[PDB]
Amino acid sequence: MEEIIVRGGNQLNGTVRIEGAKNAVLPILAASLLAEEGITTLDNVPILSDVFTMNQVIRHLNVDVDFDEQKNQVTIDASRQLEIEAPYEYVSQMRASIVVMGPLLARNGHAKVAMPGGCAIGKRPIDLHLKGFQALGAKIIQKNGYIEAIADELIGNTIYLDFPSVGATQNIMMAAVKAKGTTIIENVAREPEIVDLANILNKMGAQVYGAGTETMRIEGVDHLHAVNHSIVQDRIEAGTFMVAAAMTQGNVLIADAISEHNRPLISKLIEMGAEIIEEEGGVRVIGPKHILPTDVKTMPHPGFPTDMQAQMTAIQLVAEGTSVVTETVFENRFQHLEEMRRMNAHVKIDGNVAIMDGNHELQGAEVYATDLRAAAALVLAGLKANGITRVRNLNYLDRGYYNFHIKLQQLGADVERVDM
Ligand SMILES: CC(=O)N[C@H]1[C@@H](OP(=O)(O)OP(=O)(O)OC[C@H]2O[C@@H](n3ccc(=O)[nH]c3=O)[C@H](O)[C@@H]2O)O[C@H](CO)[C@@H](O)[C@@H]1O
Ligand SMILES: *[C@H](C)[C@H](O)P(=O)(O)O
Ligand SMILES: [Cl-]
Ligand SMILES: [K+]
Ligand SMILES: [K+]
Ligand SMILES: [K+]
Ligand SMILES: [K+]
Ligand SMILES: [K+]
Ligand code: NA
């Protein structure tokens, strides 16, 4: 139905406002299932397709969910007896749908949830979620396609995560808050959305210690209640605009940006010649006349985030030399580079390593997003391409960006969203 059309060759200048984080609001919506009494009010909720999908997941569990889009506010009433089967129709259309399992085990000792969807960028198993629930006393059944977890009593345990999985950390945390005694989770995700989640849980009456460190300690409680919470700013949307500014000889203030949440990105953009200044109003990015090449290796926190990789390849592909990216987190997150070949990108891919020769002019082309960050990366490449770039499959973009074309237009970019 729709495409984003870009004409390249404009400098970006001005101030951009950033929405609440996609990847904080979704597990916090799941956490609202733990509030046995009261009404949860979430503020700074972004208008994203994943929020509408997650709200339908939760409503099917016998919960009232009201999204006031004008106020960026969601109210949740989970005070009734929860149903325990999440609806495949919605679960299959996003990733974070799976993290209703933890709260359903905490409230009811019973959860039925299918394998989730989301960005089609690798195998994306959930084995570590299921291992953690087993460690807390759940029996895990697969009937013919389905995943059922049953716990007559959740009991705290020590749980070592083989990989610091964001979703597994969230799912296990949300079961453990109502487990009997102490849970210790070793090698947890340290991403700042884990901290935002822990902070709302603690406000709701939980005892979650060590969020943002490698070891979490949870002391089970009998009851959680509803609170008011404001979602943390979206560090990935923030970072996307930092890259846009850095690649267009721009001067952009990212309003109220949290520099602590983008230390790797800021460091790498400085290596490429950006000037980045922490100001009273936000983080200012000044793009250089001569973009310098740099290498990127994705890693779990505290290394370079995989959710900035695609966007970063757009600036690497216009740098004055050869850059390398190594994608260590996901197995299939280079399809945007194949599309950028249509735009005259010179890139060699060998397993998890891509080598980019930026000494070529990108040319406008019709390109097809395959996933959320790939869509943003193709629009960014458009900002530097000679002529007209048409970015298609905006369903992927709408999972994580609100008004992306309007925010770019307001910085002086020639970007439109139109019907095909
Ligand atoms: C909705 C949401 O918050 N999405 C984010 C979340 O996804 P998500 O929570 O799916 O990401 P994980 O941290 O779990 O996955 C990272 C890697 O861990 C491994 N793994 C994970 C779980 C498991 O049970 N077994 C296993 O092996 C896989 O190698 C996977 O490739 O964190 C990712 C990593 O920063 C981000 O890219 C996503 O945007
Ligand atoms: C792309 C990786 C998205 O953030 P998810 O919601 O599928 O994880
Ligand atoms: Cl996607
Ligand atoms: K319980
Ligand atoms: K039960
Ligand atoms: K917050
Ligand atoms: K170049
Ligand atoms: K890879
Ligand atoms: Na969508």
Author numbering: 1 to 420
Quoted from the paper:
MurAA catalyzes the first committed step of peptidoglycan synthesis, transferring an enolpyruvate moiety from phosphoenolpyruvate (PEP) to UDP-N-acetylglucosamine to produce UDP-GlcNAc-enolpyruvate and inorganic phosphate. MurAA comprises two domains with the active site Cys119 located in a flexible loop (Ala114–Ile126) that is solvent exposed in the ligand-free state. We refer to the domain containing the active site loop as the “catalytic domain” (residues 21–232) and the other as the “C-terminal domain” (residues 1–20, 233–419).
FOS inhibits MurAA by blocking access to the catalytic site making Cys119 inaccessible to PEP. Fosfomycin is an irreversible inhibitor of MurAA and is structurally analogous to the substrate PEP. Based on the structure of E. faecium MurAA, both the A149E and G220V mutations are located in the catalytic domain of the protein but distal from the active site. In addition to being quite distant from the active site, positions 149 and 220 are proximal to each other, and are both surface exposed, suggesting that these mutations could comprise part of a protein surface involved in interactions with other proteins. The structures of E. faecium MurAA with FOS–UDP-GlcNAc and by serendipity UDP–MurNAc suggest that, like other members of the MurA family, the protein transitions from an open to closed conformation upon UDP-GlcNAc binding.
